[PDB]
PDB file of C-alpha atoms in Angstrom:
ATOM      1  CA  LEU A   1      89.557  34.389-218.129  1.00 27.59           C
ATOM      2  CA  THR A   2      91.916  37.337-217.802  1.00 24.47           C
ATOM      3  CA  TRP A   3      91.342  41.003-218.275  1.00 25.78           C
ATOM      4  CA  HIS A   4      92.760  40.854-221.755  1.00 27.04           C
ATOM      5  CA  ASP A   5      90.414  38.037-222.707  1.00 28.66           C
ATOM      6  CA  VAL A   6      87.352  40.055-221.726  1.00 27.64           C
ATOM      7  CA  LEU A   7      88.642  43.547-222.573  1.00 25.20           C
ATOM      8  CA  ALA A   8      90.470  42.868-225.857  1.00 28.20           C
ATOM      9  CA  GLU A   9      87.545  43.938-227.995  1.00 27.22           C
ATOM     10  CA  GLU A  10      86.713  47.015-225.926  1.00 26.47           C
ATOM     11  CA  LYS A  11      90.301  48.121-226.249  1.00 26.96           C
ATOM     12  CA  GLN A  12      89.935  48.211-230.057  1.00 26.01           C
ATOM     13  CA  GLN A  13      86.933  50.522-229.961  1.00 27.66           C
ATOM     14  CA  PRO A  14      87.439  53.953-231.466  1.00 28.17           C
ATOM     15  CA  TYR A  15      86.360  55.808-228.320  1.00 28.11           C
ATOM     16  CA  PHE A  16      88.994  53.914-226.317  1.00 26.45           C
ATOM     17  CA  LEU A  17      91.883  54.287-228.723  1.00 31.87           C
ATOM     18  CA  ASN A  18      90.932  57.934-229.098  1.00 34.48           C
ATOM     19  CA  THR A  19      91.147  58.411-225.334  1.00 32.92           C
ATOM     20  CA  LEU A  20      94.660  57.102-225.391  1.00 32.18           C
ATOM     21  CA  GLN A  21      95.729  59.186-228.389  1.00 34.10           C
ATOM     22  CA  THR A  22      94.293  62.304-226.699  1.00 34.95           C
ATOM     23  CA  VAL A  23      96.274  61.543-223.525  1.00 34.10           C
ATOM     24  CA  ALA A  24      99.433  61.012-225.574  1.00 32.49           C
ATOM     25  CA  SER A  25      98.796  64.376-227.242  1.00 34.00           C
ATOM     26  CA  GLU A  26      98.267  66.142-223.967  1.00 31.02           C
ATOM     27  CA  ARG A  27     101.517  64.725-222.555  1.00 33.07           C
ATOM     28  CA  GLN A  28     103.424  66.623-225.247  1.00 30.65           C
ATOM     29  CA  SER A  29     101.258  69.766-225.213  1.00 29.83           C
ATOM     30  CA  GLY A  30     102.987  71.658-222.423  1.00 29.68           C
ATOM     31  CA  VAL A  31     101.009  70.236-219.490  1.00 29.69           C
ATOM     32  CA  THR A  32     101.847  67.233-217.372  1.00 29.89           C
ATOM     33  CA  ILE A  33      99.460  64.290-217.133  1.00 32.00           C
ATOM     34  CA  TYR A  34      99.171  61.906-214.213  1.00 30.55           C
ATOM     35  CA  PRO A  35      99.846  59.109-213.715  1.00 33.85           C
ATOM     36  CA  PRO A  36     102.654  58.220-216.128  1.00 33.17           C
ATOM     37  CA  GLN A  37     101.621  56.163-219.163  1.00 28.95           C
ATOM     38  CA  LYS A  38     103.141  52.949-217.835  1.00 27.85           C
ATOM     39  CA  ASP A  39     100.996  53.257-214.727  1.00 30.12           C
ATOM     40  CA  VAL A  40      97.521  54.105-216.115  1.00 32.03           C
ATOM     41  CA  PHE A  41      96.381  50.460-216.011  1.00 31.73           C
ATOM     42  CA  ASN A  42      98.192  49.300-212.884  1.00 31.51           C
ATOM     43  CA  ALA A  43      94.986  48.271-211.121  1.00 30.35           C
ATOM     44  CA  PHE A  44      94.653  45.632-213.797  1.00 30.20           C
ATOM     45  CA  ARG A  45      98.328  44.650-213.612  1.00 30.39           C
ATOM     46  CA  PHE A  46      98.222  44.065-209.898  1.00 29.34           C
ATOM     47  CA  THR A  47      94.757  42.530-209.642  1.00 29.65           C
ATOM     48  CA  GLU A  48      93.890  40.022-212.363  1.00 29.27           C
ATOM     49  CA  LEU A  49      90.228  39.422-213.144  1.00 29.31           C
ATOM     50  CA  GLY A  50      90.247  35.981-211.502  1.00 29.98           C
ATOM     51  CA  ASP A  51      91.960  37.494-208.441  1.00 31.00           C
ATOM     52  CA  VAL A  52      89.449  40.268-207.721  1.00 33.32           C
ATOM     53  CA  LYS A  53      88.041  39.903-204.176  1.00 32.25           C
ATOM     54  CA  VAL A  54      87.108  43.477-203.278  1.00 32.23           C
ATOM     55  CA  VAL A  55      86.455  46.425-205.599  1.00 35.65           C
ATOM     56  CA  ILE A  56      86.993  49.917-204.269  1.00 36.76           C
ATOM     57  CA  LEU A  57      86.199  52.703-206.655  1.00 36.40           C
ATOM     58  CA  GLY A  58      87.794  56.102-206.607  1.00 35.96           C
ATOM     59  CA  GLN A  59      86.826  58.812-209.101  1.00 36.47           C
ATOM     60  CA  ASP A  60      89.780  60.984-210.249  1.00 35.18           C
ATOM     61  CA  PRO A  61      93.509  60.100-209.973  1.00 33.83           C
ATOM     62  CA  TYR A  62      95.433  62.346-207.632  1.00 31.16           C
ATOM     63  CA  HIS A  63      96.716  65.333-209.599  1.00 31.33           C
ATOM     64  CA  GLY A  64      99.929  66.339-207.851  1.00 26.62           C
ATOM     65  CA  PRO A  65     103.473  65.233-208.554  1.00 26.55           C
ATOM     66  CA  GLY A  66     104.437  61.775-207.284  1.00 24.79           C
ATOM     67  CA  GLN A  67     100.939  61.035-206.004  1.00 22.50           C
ATOM     68  CA  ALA A  68      98.994  58.943-208.535  1.00 17.41           C
ATOM     69  CA  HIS A  69     100.469  55.642-209.650  1.00 16.57           C
ATOM     70  CA  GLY A  70      97.461  53.856-211.140  1.00 20.80           C
ATOM     71  CA  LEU A  71      95.693  52.609-208.010  1.00 22.66           C
ATOM     72  CA  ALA A  72      92.715  54.384-206.449  1.00 23.61           C
ATOM     73  CA  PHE A  73      93.543  56.226-203.214  1.00 22.43           C
ATOM     74  CA  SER A  74      97.199  54.995-203.089  1.00 23.97           C
ATOM     75  CA  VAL A  75     100.341  57.139-203.285  1.00 24.21           C
ATOM     76  CA  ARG A  76     103.981  56.243-203.948  1.00 24.69           C
ATOM     77  CA  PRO A  77     106.246  55.532-200.952  1.00 21.28           C
ATOM     78  CA  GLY A  78     107.639  58.777-199.556  1.00 22.01           C
ATOM     79  CA  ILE A  79     104.569  60.819-200.446  1.00 21.76           C
ATOM     80  CA  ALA A  80     102.317  62.167-197.728  1.00 20.56           C
ATOM     81  CA  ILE A  81      99.142  60.223-197.155  1.00 19.25           C
ATOM     82  CA  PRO A  82      96.358  62.234-198.836  1.00 19.85           C
ATOM     83  CA  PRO A  83      93.259  63.224-196.825  1.00 23.26           C
ATOM     84  CA  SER A  84      90.958  60.562-198.399  1.00 22.39           C
ATOM     85  CA  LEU A  85      93.387  57.765-197.449  1.00 23.82           C
ATOM     86  CA  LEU A  86      93.962  59.225-193.977  1.00 20.73           C
ATOM     87  CA  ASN A  87      90.203  58.968-193.433  1.00 23.96           C
ATOM     88  CA  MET A  88      90.200  55.392-194.658  1.00 23.78           C
ATOM     89  CA  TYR A  89      92.970  54.684-192.179  1.00 21.65           C
ATOM     90  CA  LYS A  90      91.021  56.329-189.368  1.00 21.03           C
ATOM     91  CA  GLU A  91      88.041  54.044-190.025  1.00 22.66           C
ATOM     92  CA  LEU A  92      90.464  51.087-190.201  1.00 25.39           C
ATOM     93  CA  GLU A  93      92.057  52.052-186.853  1.00 25.15           C
ATOM     94  CA  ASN A  94      88.645  52.270-185.315  1.00 27.15           C
ATOM     95  CA  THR A  95      87.470  48.855-186.553  1.00 27.00           C
ATOM     96  CA  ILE A  96      90.137  46.311-187.421  1.00 27.64           C
ATOM     97  CA  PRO A  97      91.733  44.632-184.477  1.00 29.39           C
ATOM     98  CA  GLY A  98      95.443  45.505-184.214  1.00 27.43           C
ATOM     99  CA  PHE A  99      95.377  48.152-186.905  1.00 26.47           C
ATOM    100  CA  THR A 100      97.575  51.222-186.358  1.00 24.75           C
ATOM    101  CA  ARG A 101      98.252  54.329-188.429  1.00 28.38           C
ATOM    102  CA  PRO A 102     100.625  53.389-191.258  1.00 29.33           C
ATOM    103  CA  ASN A 103     103.630  55.542-191.975  1.00 27.41           C
ATOM    104  CA  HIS A 104     102.932  55.545-195.740  1.00 24.46           C
ATOM    105  CA  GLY A 105     100.091  55.692-198.282  1.00 26.14           C
ATOM    106  CA  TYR A 106     101.138  52.894-200.641  1.00 29.56           C
ATOM    107  CA  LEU A 107      98.487  50.218-201.251  1.00 26.42           C
ATOM    108  CA  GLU A 108     100.161  47.776-203.616  1.00 27.16           C
ATOM    109  CA  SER A 109      99.846  45.108-200.966  1.00 28.27           C
ATOM    110  CA  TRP A 110      96.084  45.582-201.006  1.00 29.69           C
ATOM    111  CA  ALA A 111      95.938  45.099-204.762  1.00 29.90           C
ATOM    112  CA  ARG A 112      98.142  42.053-204.634  1.00 31.02           C
ATOM    113  CA  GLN A 113      95.619  40.540-202.159  1.00 32.15           C
ATOM    114  CA  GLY A 114      92.692  41.005-204.553  1.00 33.07           C
ATOM    115  CA  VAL A 115      91.605  44.584-203.837  1.00 27.33           C
ATOM    116  CA  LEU A 116      90.845  46.184-207.188  1.00 27.01           C
ATOM    117  CA  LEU A 117      91.646  49.851-206.681  1.00 25.37           C
ATOM    118  CA  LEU A 118      89.941  51.292-209.700  1.00 28.77           C
ATOM    119  CA  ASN A 119      89.470  54.977-210.382  1.00 27.00           C
ATOM    120  CA  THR A 120      86.557  55.614-212.735  1.00 24.89           C
ATOM    121  CA  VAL A 121      88.723  58.183-214.635  1.00 20.10           C
ATOM    122  CA  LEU A 122      92.298  56.986-215.220  1.00 19.11           C
ATOM    123  CA  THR A 123      94.239  60.201-216.131  1.00 20.74           C
ATOM    124  CA  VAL A 124      94.226  63.867-215.077  1.00 21.75           C
ATOM    125  CA  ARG A 125      95.991  67.104-215.973  1.00 24.19           C
ATOM    126  CA  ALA A 126      98.338  68.247-213.225  1.00 22.14           C
ATOM    127  CA  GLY A 127      96.612  70.372-210.619  1.00 26.06           C
ATOM    128  CA  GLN A 128      93.277  70.172-212.464  1.00 24.95           C
ATOM    129  CA  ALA A 129      90.832  67.754-210.931  1.00 26.04           C
ATOM    130  CA  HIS A 130      88.327  66.054-213.258  1.00 24.52           C
ATOM    131  CA  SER A 131      90.038  67.559-216.253  1.00 20.87           C
ATOM    132  CA  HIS A 132      89.936  64.244-218.176  1.00 20.51           C
ATOM    133  CA  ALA A 133      86.454  63.195-217.012  1.00 17.00           C
ATOM    134  CA  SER A 134      84.851  63.651-220.418  1.00 19.75           C
ATOM    135  CA  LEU A 135      87.601  61.851-222.431  1.00 23.17           C
ATOM    136  CA  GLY A 136      86.129  58.306-222.570  1.00 21.13           C
ATOM    137  CA  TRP A 137      87.463  56.711-219.395  1.00 20.82           C
ATOM    138  CA  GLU A 138      84.042  56.568-217.742  1.00 20.02           C
ATOM    139  CA  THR A 139      82.768  54.537-220.664  1.00 22.84           C
ATOM    140  CA  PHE A 140      85.691  52.165-220.276  1.00 21.56           C
ATOM    141  CA  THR A 141      85.314  51.715-216.535  1.00 20.28           C
ATOM    142  CA  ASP A 142      81.593  51.249-217.038  1.00 26.92           C
ATOM    143  CA  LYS A 143      82.456  48.225-219.111  1.00 27.91           C
ATOM    144  CA  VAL A 144      85.015  46.997-216.618  1.00 29.32           C
ATOM    145  CA  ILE A 145      82.433  46.991-213.800  1.00 27.34           C
ATOM    146  CA  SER A 146      79.883  45.348-216.086  1.00 28.92           C
ATOM    147  CA  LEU A 147      82.385  42.608-216.927  1.00 29.49           C
ATOM    148  CA  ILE A 148      83.203  41.938-213.247  1.00 29.94           C
ATOM    149  CA  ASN A 149      79.469  41.671-212.578  1.00 31.94           C
ATOM    150  CA  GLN A 150      79.020  39.172-215.438  1.00 34.81           C
ATOM    151  CA  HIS A 151      82.164  37.121-215.227  1.00 35.35           C
ATOM    152  CA  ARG A 152      82.828  36.856-211.457  1.00 36.51           C
ATOM    153  CA  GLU A 153      80.830  35.674-208.490  1.00 37.68           C
ATOM    154  CA  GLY A 154      80.835  36.858-204.913  1.00 36.17           C
ATOM    155  CA  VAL A 155      82.920  40.042-205.311  1.00 33.11           C
ATOM    156  CA  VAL A 156      82.638  42.709-202.620  1.00 36.46           C
ATOM    157  CA  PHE A 157      82.012  46.175-203.996  1.00 36.16           C
ATOM    158  CA  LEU A 158      82.686  49.127-201.659  1.00 37.35           C
ATOM    159  CA  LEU A 159      80.842  52.025-203.336  1.00 40.69           C
ATOM    160  CA  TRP A 160      81.839  55.324-201.726  1.00 38.19           C
ATOM    161  CA  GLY A 161      80.061  58.418-202.976  1.00 40.84           C
ATOM    162  CA  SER A 162      77.067  58.997-205.248  1.00 36.52           C
ATOM    163  CA  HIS A 163      79.310  58.741-208.326  1.00 37.17           C
ATOM    164  CA  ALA A 164      80.545  55.225-207.462  1.00 33.84           C
ATOM    165  CA  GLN A 165      77.096  54.189-206.351  1.00 35.64           C
ATOM    166  CA  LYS A 166      75.616  55.282-209.682  1.00 37.15           C
ATOM    167  CA  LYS A 167      78.258  53.337-211.512  1.00 38.40           C
ATOM    168  CA  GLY A 168      77.556  50.231-209.494  1.00 36.90           C
ATOM    169  CA  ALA A 169      73.797  50.275-209.807  1.00 38.74           C
ATOM    170  CA  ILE A 170      73.906  47.488-212.427  1.00 38.65           C
ATOM    171  CA  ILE A 171      75.639  45.091-210.047  1.00 37.54           C
ATOM    172  CA  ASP A 172      73.680  42.042-209.013  1.00 40.11           C
ATOM    173  CA  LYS A 173      73.382  42.423-205.212  1.00 40.41           C
ATOM    174  CA  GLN A 174      72.447  38.735-204.862  1.00 37.07           C
ATOM    175  CA  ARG A 175      75.500  37.401-206.699  1.00 38.79           C
ATOM    176  CA  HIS A 176      77.852  40.081-205.356  1.00 42.32           C
ATOM    177  CA  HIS A 177      78.046  41.973-202.101  1.00 45.28           C
ATOM    178  CA  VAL A 178      77.535  45.738-202.447  1.00 43.79           C
ATOM    179  CA  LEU A 179      78.269  48.071-199.514  1.00 43.39           C
ATOM    180  CA  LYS A 180      77.544  51.805-199.687  1.00 40.70           C
ATOM    181  CA  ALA A 181      78.914  54.816-197.841  1.00 40.64           C
ATOM    182  CA  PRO A 182      79.811  58.474-198.462  1.00 40.37           C
ATOM    183  CA  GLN A 183      83.248  59.218-199.880  1.00 40.33           C
ATOM    184  CA  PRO A 184      86.181  59.356-197.409  1.00 40.87           C
ATOM    185  CA  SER A 185      87.217  62.838-198.487  1.00 40.99           C
ATOM    186  CA  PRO A 186      87.062  65.577-195.846  1.00 45.14           C
ATOM    187  CA  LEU A 187      83.850  67.058-197.330  1.00 41.70           C
ATOM    188  CA  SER A 188      81.776  64.024-196.430  1.00 46.14           C
ATOM    189  CA  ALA A 189      83.821  61.568-194.323  1.00 45.70           C
ATOM    190  CA  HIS A 190      82.214  62.503-191.030  1.00 47.86           C
ATOM    191  CA  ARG A 191      78.772  62.335-192.599  1.00 48.55           C
ATOM    192  CA  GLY A 192      78.653  58.578-192.908  1.00 43.40           C
ATOM    193  CA  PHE A 193      82.035  57.232-193.964  1.00 38.80           C
ATOM    194  CA  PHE A 194      83.202  56.966-190.391  1.00 38.77           C
ATOM    195  CA  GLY A 195      81.086  54.199-188.919  1.00 39.28           C
ATOM    196  CA  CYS A 196      80.520  52.416-192.234  1.00 38.55           C
ATOM    197  CA  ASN A 197      82.650  49.487-191.031  1.00 40.85           C
ATOM    198  CA  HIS A 198      83.187  48.377-194.593  1.00 43.43           C
ATOM    199  CA  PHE A 199      86.608  46.799-194.086  1.00 44.67           C
ATOM    200  CA  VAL A 200      85.426  44.392-191.406  1.00 47.76           C
ATOM    201  CA  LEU A 201      82.232  43.686-193.362  1.00 45.45           C
ATOM    202  CA  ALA A 202      84.140  42.880-196.584  1.00 46.64           C
ATOM    203  CA  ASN A 203      86.341  40.440-194.689  1.00 45.82           C
ATOM    204  CA  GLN A 204      83.416  38.690-193.026  1.00 46.74           C
ATOM    205  CA  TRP A 205      81.905  38.152-196.493  1.00 49.37           C
ATOM    206  CA  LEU A 206      85.125  36.630-197.809  1.00 51.36           C
ATOM    207  CA  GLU A 207      85.430  34.374-194.770  1.00 48.26           C
ATOM    208  CA  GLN A 208      81.827  33.245-195.165  1.00 49.85           C
ATOM    209  CA  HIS A 209      82.965  31.870-198.541  1.00 51.15           C
ATOM    210  CA  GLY A 210      86.320  30.229-197.812  1.00 48.88           C
ATOM    211  CA  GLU A 211      88.459  33.103-199.035  1.00 48.06           C
ATOM    212  CA  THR A 212      91.280  34.643-196.999  1.00 53.44           C
ATOM    213  CA  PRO A 213      90.231  38.034-195.576  1.00 52.24           C
ATOM    214  CA  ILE A 214      92.271  41.121-196.531  1.00 53.01           C
ATOM    215  CA  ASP A 215      95.159  42.233-194.342  1.00 54.15           C
ATOM    216  CA  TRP A 216      94.328  45.938-194.473  1.00 51.80           C
ATOM    217  CA  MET A 217      97.673  47.105-192.916  1.00 52.92           C
ATOM    218  CA  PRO A 218      99.527  48.216-196.106  1.00 53.24           C
ATOM    219  CA  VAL A 219     103.152  47.259-196.499  1.00 56.86           C
ATOM    220  CA  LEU A 220     106.096  49.120-197.930  1.00 58.03           C
ATOM    221  CA  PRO A 221     108.494  47.330-200.281  1.00 58.30           C
ATOM    222  CA  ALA A 222     111.473  45.963-198.362  1.00 61.09           C
ATOM    223  CA  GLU A 223     115.134  46.780-198.815  1.00 58.75           C
ATOM    224  CA  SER A 224     117.451  44.139-200.287  1.00 63.53           C
ATOM    225  CA  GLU A 225     121.212  43.946-199.952  1.00 64.71           C
TER     226      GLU A 225
END
């Protein structure tokens, strides 16, 4: 089973097609929408259903130029590491042996290892956080989480913030492994995100089950000749 097998019907629902046509409208209305259209579903491109090991939810895509590219918390090479990802890195530096501060914020190499970096809302108007939160994306990502719960076994869910935790309440905590903490943004990171140790705990779960742990040091695409 692939995403398109299990999502094909959802993607023909009127709410879903209407979300897309509203985004397409907004893109030509005089405001800029992030991320670009070709990138909205990149979490699914980079992490197939059968390849999901760890799910990390974000909420809103970053809303500044060059930031969002379809993966929760990640930014394009060359862009400064946003505060939420810096705080994730701080927790990583404090817990994973050998980890040091990366010089970039790009997390493709996490996704290609099975880390599903799923925002619950998949578009945003430039500079206007949460501006697409009532468009239909939350219904869609509700279904996505429900389908992972149903169709996979032994996935690690890192649920950061009340919003993500609410969304993951339906997950079977016997069949899957659910870990909770506050969000890594500056408002709450020092109130429980630091010290959550989620990255080490996720890897110990995977190892428990004969899966390769995640190499959390993210890697920049290489140059070629």
